[PDB]
A = this chain, B = another copy of it.
């Protein structure tokens, strides 16, 4: 019921179509359940006491039923369409709403949650939930209605035969359900054993380096063989129980029909059934049988849809631990570009036991180039993650012109901070689209504006030399670029963004000249914090900071 209110509100914008489709479902079902009654009359017209006017009755009964079938098909076709489209619209709203919720979450969420799981929840689970309040809902509704009308029509056609069926079917159904539960137990045992053999395989294949190192390849093969030989043993037992069940179920189905023909055939003489009447009863009995299986499948899909529901309401109602677009914007006169780290303590969410910063204090002055030095893996790149507020420190404060960056709007704070990595991330778009990404509105930037920043970044030359120019598709699924080329597109993107604060992370001879010339134009008049591996940039940097054991161990000029 509380989860049903969520599913009712989800189907609510399509209430108009779902009500129309249900109206068309009613018509299609009414025409469909009338068919065995009229088919029974056709059979009796030909085979009860055929008169000379039997062909005249048959012709109007068949032409009449043809028109009803054409009407029923049109009503069913309209139902399927309206039900499918309603689901499509619900899924569409779920997809846009889920993706919006996902992108609003903090980086820490993505650090723990797999991309594939988010994509599967956005593609599979969204489609399943939409289907459950539409396609599945109408399927179970139709099935529930046809069973009801069917049982009612069996008692109408022959109360005696219907009473007999209803005295045989429940005991047999109870026995079959008990057998069905025992069969499910043997299936779980086999599937749990299969999982165990697969877990062993996954562990040894995953750690094949250790298996090889000890020469245990043949030892693991024999170990795995024993686990899958056990699966086979359990599967044979499950196969025997399934064969005995299917045989008993099959025989029951055949003998029950044989009983109805016998019992019905011997009914004398006012409770007697004509061959057409017996055809009505059998058709209605077969419709109840189908409808029972329909309700069974409906429950199976309703449970799958509820399982998908829980996975989606989990992300749709999720609140990010770090603000998305909440905070204050500092004035043009209030913002100078001076940044300060004060006793910062931080460990990544994936590895909280491994500290990255242990009492990290650093003062980056406005308009001055600060060089960050240290060994590989010391945690220099983590400084840029905390400055852009991708994570909040466990202890300590990061301030901009005396104002805590936690009080400010992170979207605005990031618009004033730019970054040029050693290996920049470029999307599978055109060179122009990737450059336009810097602007607050990449749809507002003109072709002349993209060309201007490309000339300053010394990128215009190689870009024009490409067959499609600025429309040359880069990224992973695009044209392979050199480190220097990728960096100059990253400089062009940063130049168009025009940040006050710039963060640099540091190659042949030809590339490194045009890149450093463009980096010079980019660095000028900006607060620069560069993580260096080259002694050339440390030498001309305003101040140098050494990071050792998560703390600024040394501070001052290159010579000092």
Contact = CB atoms under 8 A, between A and B. Distances in A.
A275 B324 CA distance: 76
A80 to B, nearest CB: 5
B99 A221 contact: yes
Contacts of A104: 217
B375 A92 contact: no
A220 B88 contact: no
Nearest to A113: B205
Contacts of A258: 62, 65-66, 69
Interface stretch (A118-126, A301-309, A453-461, A504-512): A118-126
How many copies are assembled? 2
A341 interface: no
Nearest to A45: B265
Given A212-B390, A213-B414, A225 B103 contact: no
Given A76-B246, A258-B62, A266-B58, A275 B214 contact: no
A447 interface: no
A122 B42 CA distance: 57
A100 B89 CA distance: 50
A119 B204 CA distance: 11
A85 to B, nearest CB: 6
A446 interface: no
B247 A76 contact: yes
A123 B415 contact: no
Contacts of A220: 103
A78 interface: yes
Interface stretch (A179-187, A435-443, A515-523): A435-443
Given A72-B254, A91-B232, A376-B377, 15 more contacts: A43-B261, A58-B262, A62-B262, A80-B246, A80-B247, A85-B236, A88-B235, A92-B232, A95-B197, A99-B201, A103-B205, A115-B206, A123-B198, A375-B376, A376-B376
